[PDB]
Amino acid sequence: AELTEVRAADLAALEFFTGCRPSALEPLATQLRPLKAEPGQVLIRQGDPALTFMLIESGRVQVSHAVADGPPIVLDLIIGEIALLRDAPRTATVVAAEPVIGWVGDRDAFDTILHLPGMFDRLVRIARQRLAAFITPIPVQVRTGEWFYLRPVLPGDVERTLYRRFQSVRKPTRALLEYLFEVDYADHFVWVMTEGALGPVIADARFVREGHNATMAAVAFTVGDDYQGRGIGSFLMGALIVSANYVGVQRFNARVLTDNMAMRKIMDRLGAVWVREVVMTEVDVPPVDTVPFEPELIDQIRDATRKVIRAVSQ
Ligand SMILES: [Ca+2]
Ligand SMILES: [Ca+2]
């Protein structure tokens, strides 16, 4: 009875929960368990089913990946939630590098957090800060001569937004799925182009698989009103082609309003025979041999592609 209330108060003292009233945390406190881990203790084990996530109050952890052809790949607030939510087995071991204090919850407790005021966006900022370490923006020069920066979308980028793959989560809520959507790279890959390495997004492009691992994918493109006709579209399409090739996608398709000529031109470059409703097309995914980028720039795009996909456990 009372110990749930000490728990709520303890939760409310996390900066993660700043601004929450303790009384609001009591049902969550019911569903969480305290974690006290010793240095060296395994928190999450590669090859386990994912049964919980952890919310860390203090102490560093270290992630490693064990393989069959050499030593474990090491690296270094929320842990284990993505495989929890996908119901995918753990692809990595997480060990305590210090004493680790925090709390353990199951998928329902994670859903409880997602539905608390302000907490969806905080959780997403946390996924975002974590993915940022796996992303190094690539300066790229478009046909105009201007320099811009290319990078995968990050969780939280507005350009992320825009029921067919997620039919593999049991008894989901919208929040669970929207959260998974923010950390999806394999079935939904989005390249983004920004002004400066840490500046605003000025265009994006995406393929969305038809369903989980489908060979066909729907593509879309967008270019800020100040950046029309600079070759930004055809460039992103280049990266988009490098990424599709890498993950298995062999065909693209596109549905467009007829007056949206700029999109249409992007597709026309690919052998688009448009068929009315307002218009649509379907085309093959040209070989990586074929993208008008130096072999060096190809490698970096594939490298960025692999990096984020692995960081998100696909
Ligand atoms: Ca970044
Ligand atoms: Ca499930």
Swiss-Prot record:
SUPFAM superfamilies xref list: Acyl-CoA N-acyltransferases (Nat) (SSF55729), cAMP-binding domain-like (SSF51206)
This protein's GO CC annotations: cAMP-dependent protein kinase complex; cytosol
Mutation effect (residue 90 to K): No increase in the rate of acetylation in the presence of cAMP, presumably because of its inability to bind cAMP
EC top class named in words: transferase
MF (Gene Ontology): metal ion binding; N-acetyltransferase activity
EC numbers on record: 2.3.1.-
Binding annotation for 3',5'-cyclic AMP: 80-83, 90-91, 130
Binding site for Mg(2+): 195
Keywords, ordered alphabetically: Acyltransferase, Magnesium, Metal-binding, Transferase
Regulation: Allosterically regulated by cAMP.
Cofactor(s) listed: Mg(2+)
Role played: Catalyzes specifically the acetylation of the epsilon-amino group of a highly conserved lysine residue in acetyl-CoA synthetase (ACS) and of the universal stress protein (USP) MSMEG_4207. Acetylation results in the inactivation of ACS activity and could be important for mycobacteria to adjust to environmental changes.
Name of the protein in question: Acetyltransferase Pat
Organism: Mycolicibacterium smegmatis (strain ATCC 700084 / mc(2)155)
